[PDB]
Symmetry: C2
Subunit: 708 residues, 2 copies
């Protein structure tokens, strides 16, 4: 087990009684269709069933035999059409499917039925998942359809093949051998994402390189698109707003200039000539120095709509990122809301605003982005981060399912009760045209795709939740563990709980209680809560915590920045009252004296210390849990995870000691005697922050030769 297969491990079912049952139920594989997508489904079922059932199962188009798996749509499988499934099937739409044990012409069968070929593919992966997770097929009758339209992954890959916030190797795309070399890995990438129902990929960095729109690169990108197409995955590209200038074709990129409009129209025509079902563009504009419409005195709708107009005749969409914050504002938290609310309704119907889960930047816990509850006339989609920019690169274990679930199940009160983030995304709150979620996965050429084996679980949960936003982190973890490691109950339960606590542990010894942005800048590996004096205050740590001898926290109530007024009234009320604000968010909204007593009875200083130390204890407990699983996991992955957990524990201690000693230096209060005193002093950990290796190829910090 080297992780290359991820969760698509088709090894013989270990429970011999269950294996025999599956062997009796699925003796043949019947596939009448022959489109590329049906062929991909058939190939997946052949390899998967053959492996899981430990016998040769070959897809055939032959007279139906007793005890067959029969797959297809009414349009390509006369057997399926003969069942007259009618409305029940039709209601599942263009990507849904029905899995059902039934009879056809007196033969015992299990069907994978859908309206479209991609629905057959998705259903086929679910059928395999049922076997992989040891679910019974007897009396099976289950249907499913995705709850979001655009279920996409994002890769922050540079064309040099270095990945920005990439902890899993070089970019998968081997530009030097494209288009000529159609690497098997491109197909395996497509299988991985299609197994989750992911139907789009943005393959290139949002800090966008204009070369992707050149013929040289489009020929390469078209080869990738061709590999992805049978698996239902559309190609998207991040674009550079200044491309007309970069190509030397126009002396401006102003979206109101007719020459610019024409440049993008012509470029779209070129793209669609290479990739006829091209998805569209992802855009990071006017953010962190990236070009945009504001560079020409125009607004984000004028810019987005210009691009959207170019893509509309071809059916493309524009994912326009709302991650924008100008140096000039008083509270970064308020930025996106204040920038985009005036434009609600001004975007074209093929523009979708892509908004991060929170208003800052993927911090271990953030309150929900206010835009989701405010924009009632604009298409929106969520952006989540899987790659562990803020959760420890490839060395810490941090299953992200609980972060995604927490977000999706958050009640916003946008139009009263029931206005959860997931319901908003689905279109059940505000009537909308385009729905979706994007996940920043940043895998690479490492054998196991993700570096840390458990980052696979985060990618898994993302895709499952993009399909059904009400799926819990626990449900996704149970599935992933069974598919990836073992179906043994004694293994599943403790490792599932280990996964479920890992997100909170990462919060606890980095920045609990609503603290945030305490990372070393800009590499983000280790602690630096003392960070100050950067060219912009909102890039520092002190800006956010505002720690002093008297207290800590950032006042965003009516008496401070009043960011709470950007939320619906029930949220503003709940979060603005000390009696109701959740402690896990409190310092986002309140500057509190250190003597404030928390629910536990500890004062705020004591609680801060308690949480930091709790995070380390949680890591140690994870180590003990993992050691107890040796009998159930292959030796190689066992050893790898064990080692990584040791690194994590060392780094968690460094985080805890650095932050506690730093906040102590400001508050001037003792660490209670029942907590182990840090091994060294504050200056020592400032030295460690300057000298501890940063394990990422992209960020310049990994090249830093500082030794003191």
């Amino acid at each position: 087990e080297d992780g290359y297969d991820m969760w698509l491990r088709y090894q013989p079912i270990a429970d011999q009684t269950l294996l025999k049952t599956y062997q009796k139920q699925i003796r043949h594989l019947h596939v009448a269709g022959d489109s590329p997508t049906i062929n991909a489904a058939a190939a997946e079922l052949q390899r998967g069933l053959s492996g899981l059932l430990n016998k040769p199962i070959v897809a055939r188009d032959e007279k139906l035999k007793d005890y067959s798996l029969v797959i297809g749509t009414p349009d390509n499988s006369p057997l399926i059409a003969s069942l007259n499934l009618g409305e029940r099937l039709q209601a599942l739409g263009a990507e849904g499917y029905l899995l059902e044990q039934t009879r056809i012409n007196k033969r015992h069968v299990v069907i994978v039925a859908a309206n479209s070929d991609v629905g057959v593919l998705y259903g086929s992966f679910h059928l395999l998942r049922l076997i992989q997770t040891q679910h019974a097929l007897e009396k099976l009758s289950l249907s499913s359809a995705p709850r979001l339209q655009h279920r996409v992954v994002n890769h922050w890959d540079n064309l040099n093949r270095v990945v920005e916030r990439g902890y899993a190797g070089l970019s998968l795309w081997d530009w030097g051998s494209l288009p000529n070399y159609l690497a098997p890995r491109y197909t395996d990438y497509a299988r991985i994402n299609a197994s989750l129902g992911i139907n789009g990929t943005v393959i290139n960095n949002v800090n966008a390189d204009p070369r992707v729109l050149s013929d040289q690169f489009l020929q390469k990108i078209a080869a990738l698109a061709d590999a992805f197409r049978p698996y239902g995955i559309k190609m998207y590209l991040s674009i550079n707003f200044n491309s007309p200038r970069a190509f030397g074709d126009v002396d401006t990129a102003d979206p109101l200039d007719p020459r610019v409009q024409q440049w993008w129209k012509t470029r779209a025509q070129k793209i669609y000539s290479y990739i006829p079902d091209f998805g569209g563009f992802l855009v990071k504009a006017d953010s962190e120095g990236q070009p945009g419409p504001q560079g020409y005195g125009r607004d984000h709708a004028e810019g987005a709509n210009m691009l959207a107009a170019a893509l509309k005749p071809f059916g493309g969409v524009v994912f326009w990122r709302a991650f924008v914050y100008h140096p000039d504002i008083e509270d970064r938290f308020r930025g996106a809301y204040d920038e985009f609310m005036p434009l609600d309704g001004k975007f074209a119907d093929n523009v979708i605003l892509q908004i991060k889960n929170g208003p800052i930047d993927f911090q271990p816990r953030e309150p929900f982005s206010a835009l989701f509850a405010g924009m009632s006339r604009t298409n929106m989609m969520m952006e989540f981060q899987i790659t562990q920019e803020y959760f420890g690169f490839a060395t810490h274990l941090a299953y992200q399912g609980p972060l995604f679930e927490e977000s999706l199940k958050t009640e916003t009160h946008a139009r009263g009760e029931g206005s959860t983030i997931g319901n908003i995304l689905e279109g059940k709150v505000f009537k909308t045209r385009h729905t979706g979620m994007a996940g920043v996965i940043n895998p690479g050429t490492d054998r196991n795709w993700t570096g840390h084996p458990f980052v696979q679980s985060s990618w898994y949960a993302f895709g499952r939740m993009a399909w059904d936003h009400q799926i819990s982190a626990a449900t996704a973890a149970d599935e992933w563990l069974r598919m990836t490691f073992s179906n043994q109950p004694a293994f599943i339960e403790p490792v599932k709980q280990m996964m479920l606590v890992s997100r909170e542990a990462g919060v606890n010894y980095r920045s609990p209680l609503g603290l945030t942005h305490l990372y070393s800048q800009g590499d983000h590996y280790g602690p630096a809560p003392w960070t100050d004096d950067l060219p912009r205050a909102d890039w520092t740590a002190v800006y956010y915590h505002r720690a002093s001898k008297t207290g800590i926290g950032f006042n965003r109530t009516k008496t401070g920045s009043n960011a709470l007024a950007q939320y619906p009234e029930p949220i503003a009320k709940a979060w603005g009252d000390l009696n109701s604000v959740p402690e896990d968010l409190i310092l986002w909204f309140h500057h509190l004296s250190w003597d404030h007593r928390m629910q536990s009875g500890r004062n705020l200083w004591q609680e801060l210390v308690h949480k930091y130390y709790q995070g380390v204890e949680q890591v140690r407990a994870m180590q003990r849990t993992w050691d107890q699983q040796e009998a159930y996991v292959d030796a190689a992955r066992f050893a790898q995870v064990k080692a990584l957990l040791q690194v994590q524990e060392r780094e968690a201690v460094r985080w805890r000691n650095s932050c506690v000693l730093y906040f102590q230096s400001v508050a001037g209060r003792p660490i209670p005697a029942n907590y182990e005193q840090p091994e060294h002093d504050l200056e020592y950990y400032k030295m460690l922050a300057r000298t501890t290796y940063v394990p990422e190829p992209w960020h310049p910090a990994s090249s830093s030769r500082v030794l003191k």
Copy 2:
């Protein structure tokens, strides 16, 4: 077949008659010893024999059975001792071995015998190689001992894990998880190199990072050294001469300053506390801005000897690179010789000068480095390049065996006939005490280690030739092809010949006839023979070719720079006379009119055009040859090599057109009508040089956004 095993593919012997024979001969594996090295040999033989013979062969220490393979030294195996090998073993020295079919108390055996455990390891790999290449064991009786002491690989790896001139992925060394995670791949790396008898590795870039000498990194490096030790591979590190300053411990790095001498002595003590058998240091000093003794007004012996004195008590050596050339000299060709000749005899006995095969920089063909024939009182070692900095990265097929063989068998006439480079390296010509060869391999995390599958053949040849410098490129290719792909004679012959011509093809489409240094600077992927106006003239192309309307070439005879006088008289005489100078070197030493007639009857202009076109034809012929091998190669590697060869042909045409059109523009002569004429002009290929993707993560050109 994904190339992870390289040439250690232990698949069942395909010839059923030969397989039966091996099965009869080796029925058991007898191993009395139990040191880490013997254990590693036993493990290799268990896996190797079991795979090749298709039956379970387990190493055991038990009463001898008939038809056993018996391994050991007289010290650890009484059976081996009983054979009383005597003088037979004495000739093998510390690393050699004897392989022999014989008898022990009437039992039929094949022995792997040596004086040392590492000798048994090397012998064990040779035994496996005999089976892998389908050689008979009946009547086997052979011995071998390495001809060079230090048989080392070099890795230009930065600590951020980006490899300089690295076309095969990120650095193997996962610093973020070391020392905790002892990845299996570290052991596989050791197996690969030990299989060739390679006994040392320099793991870090010659553009040296001082962090490697810090405790943080020494702990990590020690883990790697621990993984390598049972395979006989010692650890070496490239050092930064300014380290005492970088650590903030001394305000100078002058090697004559007692504080500096002490700094290095104390640092060596620290290294050896972690790695008790540490090999020593590799040094790039006073070259390309890297620090060195000359920065303190001292000479290279003063610097090298200071380091050597620090290492001497512990048995360490200093590999001091002679790759040095200053911007203000008349002819870069003369640089290293004029720098180091005055220092002959001034270096300590534990210093070895590491000299590239030629005096410029690993160009497709260079004359031998004059230092090899001139330094008679200094230890020397050769530096070869395997990574394809100048042979097309990971997209061109370029077996380097013929380059290495051509070098090693070059007659220098240093001290009579037989003064070949190989004999000089062996120490027999000048009678020196430390000998070796280093190969710059720059592998990475790509699944097949080398990116292009055929780069594996160059690594293979390097190691074979480091063991025996008279091994031919053809012999090593025959072995490698059998081990890596197939023993079918109809496959081996044409593919061996394709390999053998590939180096010359790469000379021909780039820079034939003694031309050199025509690459795009500094990325080195594509053509740029027009290159001029760089901050140093010796980094340009025009500096080397001196092409004009009247002629081309660089006068290094007595009437020019007189670099020929740096060579022994017979070489100066042969190369200085137009009647005897080899055409494949001619423009290195003569500036010739375009009307000079070559041996073919063509004038020099016509000959230049002929060679450039010939290189492209040779690539097209390699494509046809490879296509003919589809029945003998697995589909995946077949497809990959086929595609890469397409990329190579496209790039070869670009090289040909660019260079022929460039030289035409200067000479003002027509391309003979029989050749296909380019259709675009020279400006078009200058535009392609600025815009064609450079496929390497490290060099900044891969990030260039130039589009015109």
